[PDB]
From a paper:
HCMV gB is a class III fusion protein encoded by open reading frame UL55. The specific receptors and glycoproteins involved vary among different herpesviruses, although glycoprotein B (gB), which mediates membrane fusion, is highly conserved, and required for entry. Receptor binding to Trimer and Pentamer complexes is thought to trigger the irreversible transition of gB from a metastable prefusion conformation to a highly stable postfusion conformation, thereby facilitating fusion of the viral and host-cell membranes. The metastable prefusion gB trimer undergoes significant conformational rearrangement to facilitate membrane fusion.
The gB-C7 variant contains two disulfide substitutions along with a paired cavity-filling substitution (V134C/I653C, H222C/E657C, T100L/A267I). The two disulfide bonds (V134C/I653C and H222C/E657C) were designed to bridge DI and DV, whereas the cavity-filling substitutions T100L/A267I were designed to stabilize the interface between DI and DIV via hydrophobic packing. We determined a cryo-EM structure of gB-C7 in complex with 1G2 and 7H3 Fabs that reached a global resolution of 2.8 Å when refined with C3 symmetry. We performed local refinement to account for relative motion between DI bound by 1G2 and the rest of the gB-C7 complex, yielding a 3.1 Å resolution local reconstruction. We then combined the 2.8 Å global map with the 3.1 Å local map in Phenix to generate a composite map, which we used to model the gB-C7 complex. With this high-resolution map, we were able to model previously unresolved residues at the gB membrane-distal apex (residues 437 to 447 and 474 to 482). However, unlike the previously reported structure, we were unable to resolve the fusion loops of DI (residues 149 to 163, 192 to 197, and 233 to 246) or the majority of DV (residues 662 to 704). This is likely due to the omission of the MPR in our soluble ectodomain construct, which appears to be critical for interacting with the fusion loops and stabilizing DI. Further, our structure reveals that in the absence of the MPR, DI is shifted outward relative to its more compact positioning in the full-length prefusion HCMV gB structure reported previously. The membrane-distal apex of HCMV gB (DII and DIII) was stabilized in the prefusion conformation in the gB-C7 structure— in which all stabilizing substitutions were made to DI, DIV, and DV—demonstrating that stabilizing DI positioning can indeed stabilize gB in a prefusion-like conformation.
Author numbering:
A (entry chain A): 89 to 149, 164 to 191, 198 to 232, 247 to 447, 474 to 612
B (entry chain C): 79 to 88
C (entry chain C): 525 to 661
D (entry chain E): 2 to 9, 11 to 27, 27A, 27B, 28 to 95, 95A, 95B, 96 to 106
E (entry chain F): 1 to 35, 35A, 35B, 36 to 82, 82A, 82B, 82C, 83 to 100, ...
F (entry chain D): 1 to 52, 52A, 53 to 82, 82A, 82B, 82C, 83 to 100, 100A, ...
G (entry chain G): 1 to 9, 11 to 27, 27A, 27B, 28 to 106
The structure:
């Protein structure tokens, strides 16, 4: 938990609580349950993220007009990592100059792990600037939003020959796809290793030129995300339902008995992984004592999950004993096997009931989380997802926030929590002086929890 | 000025 | 209390806080098509104060006198003293009614929001998506 | 595996007649039982889907019931149009196949 | 899905004007549609491009037919029209409405040929 | 209404092939699995197999697995079952039926399962004689 | 306009390689990109080669485009009965589009 300032992502990364936990108690006490290995994948809701480049020139007279570099200058930037010292619309130059000379791009040390930036004049007048940064696009990938907040109505996978299976909504005269385009590895290096990219797309914005490398959708995007694998899974069969339970899990899954076609295109990016995961669980756990029963069956859970199932059946007790080491003896072993199977089915039924016992508790705790998320959404979401998550309350939704790590040694806590500007009012949490990385302007925020630094309106209260 | 609600069952 | 009792009894229950006890409440269904949400959540009668949840015009069944209440959760319409707070600008709130979500920016209605654009918290699976990174701005 | 049902049945208008269907641990044991009529010279018609649910256009005379690995169709009132062949069908998971019964000819 | 259908008359006199109109469906004639053009094909002979028009009305004509061919666009109705003037027997042809939809392609989407007999 | 129409009576010779057609109406042809059932004259129903109009998937009993060819035409919404190597015992009434099982879900394609043949075709009489 | 010269017909046996030429001029076919369209009688033309030597998705590898100075070429390899069509070379000359004369092919 480093000292950090967490800011909300412009209102874009919204999340909300919904009563999506449904409990259906299985009625029959039928005890011939199947055993097997299970892997569960969830529908991928997260947005596809890809790198883009943003080319701009900066005119200052502090008005700081941003303008699009000409496309030939864009080619100069991409091929030589150099930019020309002039811009024309009638003509302007660097301060007190007329050279129209070439300039070598150098790193802007003020730039971060997002929006890594390169400038020709390090003056942190006319400047030339190239930002390399992220962009996100949610399914259907018909538009993407870059980290700088610009929205582009073009599919990140439109390759100039598939507008029937993609989207293009920006101005046609300002869009250019380039086969086998050569771009340098690092704009900040005087000499860098050039790299060819199959299809590179450019779009001339009003104040910018945005470029991105077009890739194959089915090859870069996967609509299913692996959630979890259960090695000891039991399954109860109804007339039109399979009910999956796991002893280590507090969640049970329910699906119809009709299976999903495993040779479907939507499973192409998860099929081999899931199959090998099942095979690994068999090899490391059941290769000796069990045997595979049937093939891999794919089911779609009522809640939308995708289940890959491998049934397993334990070897007969004669084989188990031989690995650990006449008709009447065959009858004795048959009776032993019958007794073992009966009691094992009893155990499996009990385990299934125990697994079902968690649902009401989980539903009530979900309502508890929803109520508590209005007071501290970040703590509640961090508890739910088991990772540091910052969130803000936005009425009926929560906004996810992203945290910028600060100097970590500039954090000075003020000694006086009394609001000098207003007698009778006191700060709720102590005020902090801090500095951003590679920066010197002292900032005033308020100390939060888990080393978080708060900004905006300071929390105040009565001086009790 | 106004904006118009939408039904729901339960 | 209403949400907690609804979670406990697994049915829609309305309750009110009465000190050390809760009072159960009974709900009257209204027209369902007369619900008009006001665009301006700023309290015009008192500058510096803003509504916590948007104001609603609604009509009771078989009735025509327009009533002014406040939008609650789960399509509930609130009456009595309106919930107010300080106008902490900048503001960006999203309030859900029916199958629809209303954006209010600086306590003024901005636009509609598709519910499909808002992810739901999944406690059973608990897979998270990374938000847009920030750049020391 | 097979589904066994009596070859024929008989009765009088207003009477009740019952057709029985027997399965195994699979099929009827763990699956629904679908009942199809067939008037001689015509195509089969679904009388009962799932265990006891019934489509539109099928009279209330036909009541379906399920118990263990067995099913029954009771025809009450046994009218002159009820004389036909009745088939029980079930999904056998061991064979992964729809199994039909032998057919019961109600003659009224 | 760039459906493209013509609405021309089948029989026209060898005088006055042939008016052809092409209607777009599944999309719209907007700032992201490149050009929309007309091509003739006399029966049994090769194709011949007539004219192109853009969404903003900027139009280009073939050198030979520029005087005798007018082209217009109506983005409100998602249509665009050719008018051919001073008709002759040699104007008897199948007329195809076509366009550029993808970036790399030139004439990828073609309409349904309207046979005009002069 | 949901309806299935089947070809008329056909007479062949042992060793020929019969292509029975099944036309769908009132419902999307490729959204439901198709069952093919047979009944001999004066005998009960015999389930021949199932066909997937959405993907061309087909499974038949061993008595028909190597002798049945399945084709489809989504434009006509008509399935075709071609039975080759006709024998004297192949003369029978053939039915095509519609299952309540769908050929695909909202996201993925679905495998065969039996949910009842609610809609049946008119039937086709195939006679085989020397 | 400057119509691109193209053979009026071509032919080959099934399984043979057929070549269709397109002469043009330096200002028309040497500079701009050359496209090839396959039109079957009574049907609208279908794009066969979009750039000089690039096939749209689903156009068989049997078809290849090429350019040499001004002369553009199409070659059909492993010719099939369903290749009987008119092939048109088309490109820009001066802010204007021009097709070829169309080689009718017979198997
Ligand atoms: C500074 O010097 C550079 C060259 O040293 C000048 O760049 C040249 O700028 C002109 C336009 O002003 C470019 O012409 C353009 O060419 C492309 C095709 O390459 C065409 O599509 C455009 O419509 C336009 O004609 C020219 O190519 C470019 N020279 C290069 C890239 O080598 C620049 O103009 C000078 N600026 C000043 C203010 O003196
Ligand atoms: C542009 O993208 C399309 C898909 O939108 C590509 O088309 C696929 O190409 C592969 C390889 O030839 C085929 O296996 C797929 O069946 C095609 N799918 C579709 C829907 O067309 C196309 O090849 C890409 N074009 C370029 C030039 O890269
Ligand atoms: C599951 O989907 C696959 C394709 O993803 C289906 O495979 C097709 O099967 C038919 C019948 O054998 C073939 O004619 C096709 O060529 C196959 N397609 C491919 C792409 O291989 C398969 O039949 C489907 N299964 C079911 C039960 O519908
Ligand atoms: C891009 O490079 C590849 C590999 O050399 C080549 O096959 C392809 O034709 C090139 N692109 C174009 C548009 O020719
Ligand atoms: C498990 O073992 C089998 C052979 O028994 C092998 O095919 C499979 O790839 C193995 N899976 C692993 C190592 O994950
Ligand atoms: C499992 O797959 C094999 C082919 O690998 C197949 O022969 C077998 O029939 C399948 N299992 C079942 C239960 O049908
Ligand atoms: C962080 O703070 C330390 C201590 O004041 C300072 O020496 C260092 O330069 C700072 N680092 C930055 C501003 O990147
Ligand atoms: C409910 O509101 C609708 C729409 O204003 C109106 O037509 C209807 O009469 C109302 N019903 C009542 C007041 O019972």
């Amino acid at each position: 938990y480093p000292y950090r300032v967490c800011s909300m992502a412009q209102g874009l990364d919204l999340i909300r609580f919904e009563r999506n936990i449904v409990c259906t108690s299985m009625k029959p006490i039928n005890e011939d349950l199947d055993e097997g290995i299970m892997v569960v994948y969830k529908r991928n809701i997260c947005a596809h993220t890809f790198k883009v480049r943003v080319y701009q020139k900066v005119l200052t007279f502090s008005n700081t007009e941003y303008v699009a570099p000409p496309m030939w200058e864009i080619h100069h930037i991409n091929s030589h990592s150099q930019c020309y010292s002039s811009y024309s619309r009638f003509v302007a130059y660097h301060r007190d100059s007329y050279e129209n000379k070439t300039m070598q791009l150098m790193p802007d040390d003020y730039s971060n792990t997002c929006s890594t930036r390169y400038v020709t004049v390090k003056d942190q007048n006319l400047n030339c600037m190239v930002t390399i940064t992220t962009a996100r696009s949610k399914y259907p990938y018909h538009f993407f939003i870059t980290s700088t907040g610009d929205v582009v109505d073009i599919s990140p996978f439109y390759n100039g020959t598939n507008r029937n299976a993609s989207y293009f909504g920006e101005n046609a005269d300002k869009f250019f796809i380039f086969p086998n385009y050569t771009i340098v590895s690092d704009f900040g290096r005087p000499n860098s290793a050039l790299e060819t990219h199959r299809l590179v797309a450019f779009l001339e914005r009003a104040d910018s030129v945005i470029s991105w490398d077009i890739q194959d959708e089915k090859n870069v995007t996967c609509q299913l995300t692996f959630w979890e694998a259960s090695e000891r899974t039991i399954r109860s069969e109804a007339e039109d339902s399979y009910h999956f339970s796991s002893a280590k899990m507090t969640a049970t899954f329910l699906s119809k008995k009709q299976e999903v076609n495993m040779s479907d295109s939507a499973l192409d990016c998860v099929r081999d992984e899931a199959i090998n995961k099942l095979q690994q669980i068999f090899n490391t756990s059941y290769n000796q004592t069990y045997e595979k029963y049937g093939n891999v069956s794919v089911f779609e859970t009522t809640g939308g999950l995708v289940v890959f199932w491998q049934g397993i059946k334990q070897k007969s007790l004669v084989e188990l004993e031989r690995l650990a080491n006449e008709s009447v003896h065959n009858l004795v072993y048959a009776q032993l096997q019958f007794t073992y199977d009966t009691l094992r089915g009893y155990i499996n039924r009990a385990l299934a009931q125990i697994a079902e016992a968690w649902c009401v508790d989980q539903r009530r705790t979900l309502e508890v989380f929803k109520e508590l998320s209005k007071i501290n959404p970040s703590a509640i979401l961090s508890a739910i997802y088991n990772k540091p998550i910052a969130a803000r309350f936005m009425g009926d939704v929560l906004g996810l926030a992203s945290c910028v790590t600060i100097n970590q040694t500039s954090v000075k806590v003020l000694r006086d929590m009394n609001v000098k500007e207003s007698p009778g009012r006191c700060y709720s949490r102590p005020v902090v002086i801090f500095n951003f990385a590679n920066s010197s302007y002292v900032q005033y925020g308020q100390l939060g929890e888990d080393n978080e630094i708060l900004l905006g309106n300071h929390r105040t209260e009565e001086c009790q | 000025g106004d904006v118009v609600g939408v039904n729901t069952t339960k | 209390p209403s949400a907690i009792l609804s979670a406990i009894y697994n049915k829609p229950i309305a309750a009110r806080f009465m000190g050390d006890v809760l009072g159960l409440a009974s709900c009257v269904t209204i027209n369902q098509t007369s619900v008009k949400v006001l665009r301006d959540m700023n309290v015009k009668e008192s500058p510096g104060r803003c509504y916590s949840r948007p104001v609603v015009i609604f009509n009771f069944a078989n009735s025509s006198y327009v009533q002014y209440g406040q939008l609650g959760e789960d399509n509930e319409i609130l009456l009595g003293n309106h919930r107010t707070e300080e106008c902490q600008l900048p503001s960006l709130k999203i309030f859900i009614a029916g199958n629809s979500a209303y954006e209010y920016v600086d306590y003024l209605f901005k636009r509609m929001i598709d519910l499909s654009s808002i992810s739901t918290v999944d406690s059973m699976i608990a897979l998270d998506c990374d938000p847009l990174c920030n750049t020391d701005f | 595996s097979v589904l066994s049902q009596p070859p024929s049945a008989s009765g009088t208008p207003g009477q009740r007649v019952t057709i029985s269907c027997s399965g195994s641990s699979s099929n009827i044991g763990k699956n629904y039982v679908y009942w199809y009529q067939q008037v001689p010279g015509t195509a089969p018609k679904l009388l009962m889907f799932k265990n006891n649910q019934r489509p539109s256009g099928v009279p209330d005379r036909f009541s379906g019931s399920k118990s263990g690995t067995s099913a029954s169709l009771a025809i009450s009132g046994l009218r002159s149009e009820d004389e036909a062949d009745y088939y029980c069908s079930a999904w056998d998971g061991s064979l992964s196949r729809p199994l039909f019964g032998g057919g019961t000819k109600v003659t009224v | 899905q760039l459906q493209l259908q013509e609405s021309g008359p089948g029989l026209v006199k060898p005088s006055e004007t042939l008016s052809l109109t092409c209607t777009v469906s599944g999309a719209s004639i907007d700032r992201s549609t490149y050009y929309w053009g007309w091509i003739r094909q006399p029966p049994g002979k090769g194709l011949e491009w007539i004219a192109n028009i853009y969404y903003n009305g900027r139009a280009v004509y073939s050198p030979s037919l520029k005087s005798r061919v007018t082209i217009s666009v109506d983005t409100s109705k998602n249509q665009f029209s050719l008018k051919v003037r001073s008709l002759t027997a040699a104007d008897t042809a199948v007329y195809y409405c076509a366009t550029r939809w993808n970036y790399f392609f030139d004439f990828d989407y073609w309409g349904r040929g309207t046979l005009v007999t002069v | 209404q949901v309806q299935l129409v089947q070809s008329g009576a056909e007479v062949k010779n042992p060793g020929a092939s019969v292509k029975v057609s099944c036309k769908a109406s009132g419902y999307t042809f490729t959204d439901y699995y198709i069952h093919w059932v047979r009944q001999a004259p004066g005998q009960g129903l015999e389930w021949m197999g199932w066909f997937n109009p959405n993907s061309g998937g087909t499974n038949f009993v061993q008595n028909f697995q190597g002798r049945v060819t399945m084709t489809r035409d989504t434009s006509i919404s008509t399935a075709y079952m071609e039975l080759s190597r006709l024998r004297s015992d192949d003369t029978a009434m053939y039915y095509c039926a519609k299952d309540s099982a769908k050929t695909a879900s909202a996201y993925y394609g679905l495998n065969f399962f039996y949910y009842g043949m609610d809609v049946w075709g008119q039937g086709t009489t195939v006679t085989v004689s020397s």
